[PDB]
Amino acid sequence: GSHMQDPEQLKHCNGILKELLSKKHAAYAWPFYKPVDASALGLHDYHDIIKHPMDLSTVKRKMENRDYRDAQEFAADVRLMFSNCYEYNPPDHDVVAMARKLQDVFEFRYAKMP
Ligand SMILES: Cn1cnc2c1c(=O)[nH]c(=O)n2C
């Protein structure tokens, strides 16, 4: 059920999303900008292992379209994106190191929800 605080909490989520996409974090956010193109990258098992792909452009579309009804729904998708990275790749992969840094940006600012 919708709460009067949901619009304002979703604005905080939108601010986080804008930050994740910003130049400040681009050195480690870039693998998460667009859907994984598994065929182009030679990752021919990606869709056998990752049943629910997610990326920041999809989060952005869902925000713009008012798909997310509350902050928890938004956070679940961002976390799904990171989890997919932790599931698919070995833990010493550079993309995992980038995911951990971007997730730290996300989690610390999400925790500051007004
Ligand atoms: C999210 N993303 C974007 N590019 C990649 C990945 C990944 O998980 N593994 C991986 O190997 N590559 C190249």
Side-chain angles (χ1 to χ4, degrees):
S2 55
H3 191 281
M4 50 174 327
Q5 79 201 345
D6 292 334
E8 142 176 48
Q9 293 196 343
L10 283 171
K11 296 280 193 155
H12 183 67
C13 293
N14 196 50
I16 295 167
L17 177 61
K18 180 77 174 174
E19 176 170 1
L20 299 183
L21 290 168
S22 74
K23 174 165 176 206
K24 172 165 186 180
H25 304 296
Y28 39 92
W30 70 263
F32 309 103
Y33 284 171
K34 295 285 150 71
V36 173
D37 188 335
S39 165
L41 294 170
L43 312 178
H44 301 302
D45 54 351
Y46 190 81
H47 295 289
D48 300 286
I49 293 168
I50 300 308
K51 282 166 74 83
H52 300 101
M54 189 47 60
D55 72 283
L56 294 174
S57 76
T58 300
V59 177
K60 182 179 169 274
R61 187 182 74 238
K62 289 178 68 169
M63 187 67 46
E64 293 168 342
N65 296 351
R66 307 183 72 181
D67 196 319
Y68 297 124
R69 298 192 66 221
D70 48 69
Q72 290 73 23
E73 198 187 341
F74 163 88
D77 260 359
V78 175
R79 289 162 175 161
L80 170 63
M81 173 184 82
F82 291 126
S83 301
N84 289 343
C85 187
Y86 306 147
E87 177 174 8
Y88 180 75
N89 304 280
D92 61 342
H93 198 292
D94 192 50
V95 70
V96 171
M98 292 190 265
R100 295 180 60 210
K101 287 164 68 177
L102 196 67
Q103 183 154 26
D104 180 278
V105 176
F106 170 72
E107 294 294 342
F108 276 79
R109 190 168 174 200
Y110 186 72
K112 297 179 179 36
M113 174 71 79

